[PDB]
Structure 1
């Protein structure tokens, strides 16, 4: 009856381009043993460099969520971690032939499809959850990020863009399908920012194929938006990926108010440090647990 740890049944292979670097990258996801967690691996280097996807290894925060070990990095991990969090994958090796995870279509959709095509394997070990026991909030100017105790998993987000195209959403995975309602929400950029970003060697891989591109007054993508609230749904997708840097699925509520990688990482560090605010729990009977997972 216990909720078991999950890994991949079969390896996943993908080729793509880094959003910021524009570099061609080969991605391989491999099964991993019980209690490995998600571990990134730069296989272009000799020796190979491995970085656990944990809050302690987060470096750069500006462009995206970056993992760092000395002078080696793995850029833009948050969409793949969102896919792994959404499908309840505990243990996996992520091999990359370059510094940036491929952007694919700008959402978690392609990763979720490749993973669910390969299938998941339950492992003979209790899945560990981080349960929020006390409210933890971080603020910086007008931005806020909060964990609240909650017997389940739910995420609220609010952005405020002073832009004609542009803003609040709430998901509770007691009803919301991660796969149908969140995973397909794409990243977005303002056309006004692109020349500047290029000069700072950012958005080099950006195109209408992997991002909602916003001009003065309209989305420029011919086929438009996947969801009326795609922009804030993408912030929820990013938040789920950043939360998975705790290294286990959450039993609790997350609320974001104009937050991003930086303040989300400050929230994880504050939670981890306040051991009164959380505990590791397992469920020896799935029937009495406050969360459930799709068949593997």
Structure 2
């Protein structure tokens, strides 16, 4: 059977919160079969657990919420879990946000590969898209289509000159393309306009050229930090893989994003969940 996977060892990392700009302690731990990914606040008393599920989502990022308790910036760590096939894990945090690390899934990939993968004696569950499901918000669209595999496409025509008056497009089919090699290390674009406004309000205190490609009114300030061609759209694909993992299982299907973001992604998850004839849970015997 294709088996569930968890981590082989506990790993401890530290970084800084995107919003607080202060130290956060990150601990990844093995977890039992059918746990999913579960976030816990070990700075709180008693410790508060929030499963990484679509119905626990409460802007420019994905936030999990249970009452007055939150975990911000879950999408890059969930992308790494999805891209390495981790079904089951505990994520312990000393604060209300995942550390930003270098702004990609890369550091989480490295931590998981370093901890090692442990096979579990239970069949891995997949969510198979059986029919098309789409959501729209003005000119924005997000779509699930049936596909024998896992494929993530993204397109945006954005009217800032960094983009040269051209639509940015990328497609990744994970049967041919490596998540680790071709997606995991993509950083997002941070517009000075937006960052300066947040910092004036004592927000986004952790953001910098260390964790984003910083762009002014016209252009990229440090091209030396660029890792990929079409890096902005590769980051949107990284983001979407993380958001899709809130379904709780690996997807058998195709995602198509048209100027979509965290908000329209989560609306697509909720529309899929409601349309119960559009998906099924399947296992494989190799």
Place the TM-score, normalised by the shorter chain, in its bin: over 0.9
Distance 1:169 1:274 in 2: 28
Spell out, residue by residue over 1:2-51, the C-alpha distance to the aligned partner (whole angstroms, 9 max, x if none). 11000000112110111122231000000000000000000000000000
Identify if the C-alpha distance between structure 1 residues 264 and 210 changes in structure 2 by more than 3 Å, giving closer, same or farther: same
Matched, 1:104 2:101: yes
**Cα distance, 1:252 vs structure 2:** 0.1
Distance 1:137 1:163 in 2: 27
Consecutive unaligned residues in structure 2, runs of 5 or more: none
- Tell me, what secondary structure is at the counterpart of 1:50? strand
**Cα distance, 1:164 vs structure 2:** 2.0
**Cα distance, 1:222 vs structure 2:** 5.6
8 Å CA contact 1:15–1:27 kept in 2: the answer is: yes
Identify if the C-alpha distance between structure 1 residues 159 and 20 changes in structure 2 by more than 3 Å, giving closer, same or farther: farther
Spell out, residue by residue over 1:35-77, the C-alpha distance to the aligned partner (whole angstroms, 9 max, x if none). 0000000000000000000001000xx0310000000000000
Provide the alpha-carbon RMSD of the alignment.
1.0
Matched, 1:182 2:179: no
Structure 1 segments, 4+ long, off by >4 Å, are none
Query: Which residue of 1 is the match for residue 270 of structure 2?
Result: 269
Which stretch has the larger CA shift, 84-93 or 199-208?
199-208
**Cα distance, 1:200 vs structure 2:** 4.1
- Tell me, what secondary structure is at the counterpart of 1:223? helix
**Cα distance, 1:150 vs structure 2:** 0.3
8 Å CA contact 1:146–1:267 kept in 2: the answer is: yes
- Tell me, what secondary structure is at the counterpart of 1:14? strand
Spell out, residue by residue over 1:144-198, the C-alpha distance to the aligned partner (whole angstroms, 9 max, x if none). 0000000000000012221222111000001010000000001221012222122
**Cα distance, 1:248 vs structure 2:** 0.2
Distance 2:223 2:282 in 1: 47
Distance 2:169 2:223 in 1: 25
**Cα distance, 1:215 vs structure 2:** 1.4
Spell out, residue by residue over 1:118-144, the C-alpha distance to the aligned partner (whole angstroms, 9 max, x if none). 110010000000000010000011100
TM normalised by structure 1 equals 0.93
Query: Which residue of 1 is the match for residue 12 of structure 2?
Result: 13
Distance 2:32 2:94 in 1: 22
Distance 1:171 1:141 in 2: 26
Mapping 1:93-132, distance limit 5 Å: 93-132=90-129
- Tell me, what secondary structure is at the counterpart of 2:161? coil
Distance 1:54 1:198 in 2: 30
Count of residue correspondences: 282
Which stretch has the larger CA shift, 205-214 or 87-96?
205-214
Matched, 1:139 2:140: no
Query: Which residue of 2 is the match for residue 67 of structure 1?
Result: 64
Which stretch has the larger CA shift, 204-213 or 189-198?
189-198
8 Å CA contact 1:23–1:98 kept in 2: the answer is: no
8 Å CA contact 1:19–1:203 kept in 2: the answer is: yes
TM normalised by structure 2 equals 0.97
8 Å CA contact 1:39–1:93 kept in 2: the answer is: yes
Spell out, residue by residue over 1:86-113, the C-alpha distance to the aligned partner (whole angstroms, 9 max, x if none). 0000000000000010110010001101
**Cα distance, 1:216 vs structure 2:** 2.4
- Tell me, what secondary structure is at the counterpart of 2:127? strand
Which stretch has the larger CA shift, 199-208 or 129-138?
199-208
